[PDB]
Design a protein around this ligand. Sequence first.
Ligand SMILES: O=P(O)(O)O[C@H]1[C@H](OP(=O)(O)O)[C@@H](OP(=O)(O)O)[C@H](OP(=O)(O)O)[C@@H](OP(=O)(O)O)[C@H]1OP(=O)(O)O
Ligand SMILES: [Hg+2]
Ligand SMILES: [Hg+2]
Ligand SMILES: [Hg+2]
Ligand SMILES: [Hg+2]
Length: 410
Amino acid sequence: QSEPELKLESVVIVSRAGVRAPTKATQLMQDVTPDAWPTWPVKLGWLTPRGGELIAYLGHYQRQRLVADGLLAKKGCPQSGQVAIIADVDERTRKTGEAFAAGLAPDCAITVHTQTDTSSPDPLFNPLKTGVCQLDNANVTDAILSRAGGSIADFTGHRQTAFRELERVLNFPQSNLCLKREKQDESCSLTQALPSELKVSADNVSLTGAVSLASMLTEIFLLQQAQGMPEPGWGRITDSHQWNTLLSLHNAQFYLLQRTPEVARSRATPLLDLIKTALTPHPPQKQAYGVTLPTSVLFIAGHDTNLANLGGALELNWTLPGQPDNTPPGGELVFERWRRLSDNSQWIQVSLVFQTLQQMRDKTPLSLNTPPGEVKLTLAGCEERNAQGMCSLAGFTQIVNEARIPACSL
Ligand SMILES: O=P(O)(O)O[C@H]1[C@H](OP(=O)(O)O)[C@@H](OP(=O)(O)O)[C@H](OP(=O)(O)O)[C@@H](OP(=O)(O)O)[C@H]1OP(=O)(O)O
Ligand SMILES: [Hg+2]
Ligand SMILES: [Hg+2]
Ligand SMILES: [Hg+2]
Ligand SMILES: [Hg+2]
């Protein structure tokens, strides 16, 4: 029987945290809808038990997958250090790492390593926020406006259909923001009522107004749906086209602020360094987070901006059939090193593993038989590929080295 010509030797997963309750409950969020936002079972920004179950399913799926590729043994707990887990200091990322280990190796006790100071942000997940490095204000401003077509107005203008869909779901017309508006000479509009301005500083970039509000609100509706709440969007979201139209507002903001290279490259540099060393064969040694690398599997519990920053820095673009959110909760950017048996050459494969919005909704258990969705990625900048379309280690290493910003390494 035909034999595999490539042997899996290393896997690095960068996962976004799973389903959580919204991070905030502002007055603005209430003013754009006359209806009352549904309450969540956990504190704001915390992982919901259902969210952990969905992550555990992915962990259960990955265990079957890696076993099939012979990287992990089908029985028992993995050898010490065989599986390493690192998470951002947040409650939701720590819990995502735990839910993943739980699903991957039940009752096996796999440490979830984090930065030691938990009351402080971890620069691995954003070197801009902690001041490791700074953004070039003028250059970032030009790059974002450039990707916006010259102006934020023209940008939102091309997405009015999506903004009106959101208004419809909110019953924006009967919101206090609308009824208490002084220029009632014109129809009430989110984009009109909340002008979006681009804010850029050394440590951050943002969009004020309807752009950021809509990105947050549409993500909240996806969260309600994934959380299994009765009627997400107060029952006003009734079909797939609406889900896509709504979430496009979310993907639109990430395209501008997280994928733009002038931002992404600096923001994803620490992760690029970690991913590269973890995938590069070399003498194992205890290091960051007390983790020993290289090893067989490395699971990194991060955030959606991390996935988007990595996509922009590596020029990895994707769309996920069945999942309106390009960087969905639990979504995994999977990096794998395969060794070609023929000449023992090294190769890197990249894919985006995710659960469809329905798989989240029905909380469906995953397995090789009922697997999550997966999109194989192509490194836009790679030249040397193998028969399977993977990039050589050398090629991959070159792309990472050209994409990272030295000033932003840890
Ligand atoms: O870590 P935080 O300080 O709590 O910031 C969070 C986090 O963003 P980051 O990727 O930069 O960490 C969320 O991403 P996830 O952890 O859920 O993957 C994001 O959620 P969404 O962009 O998907 O909505 C949310 O944004 P939001 O304000 O809309 O809740 C945002 O909050 P901040 O805007 O306050 O930073
Ligand atoms: Hg540790
Ligand atoms: Hg190392
Ligand atoms: Hg996202
Ligand atoms: Hg998201």
